[PDB]
């Protein structure tokens, strides 16, 4: 479900993803998504406005955009956040991927 | 390039993609990019708006929209064809994906 983050049942790059698909665009057994990469070493260079920070298991964790990919709903595994409260952000840095400015 | 269409290097479950990502956005050593299916055998069920038809190689090809995910720069091949011809169609379906209507 949209904004919503989960873990993967099978290892990936990173440890947790935002679902970021529209809950009315339907595609059977998968779904859109953006990795987040815990942002413990992470470098404050990179561009926030493309590259949001949010906050899940009190640490801090960027949204990697440019990483956005399906995933087949087999891997879901458990949810373990909402970020629905910053959809804003999100939606920011979704579109500035695509169109820029 | 924004709508430029190339080849896989490495072999993938499809054999065109289309570089969707701004030009104005830098990610060293990858691009944002959709594949794009053979429509010749892919029902007609689907949604034109949220999967566009395009035309190349004097065929017709489904973008698939909801397959999104970013390519290294090492498996970039030869460009095939230009898209920007279609940017109305393809902008309106990155943004259903997400948006909704
Ligand atoms: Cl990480
Ligand atoms: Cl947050
Ligand atoms: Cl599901
Ligand atoms: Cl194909
Ligand atoms: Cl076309
Ligand atoms: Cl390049």
Redesign the interface.
Known sequence: MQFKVYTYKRESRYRLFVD??????D?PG?R?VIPLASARLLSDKVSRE?YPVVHIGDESWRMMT?????VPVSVIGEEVADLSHRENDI?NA?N??????
């Open positions: 970021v698909q529209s809950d009315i665009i595609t998968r859109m493309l440019t990483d956005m990919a399906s939606k979704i500035l991927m695509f169109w820029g400015i």
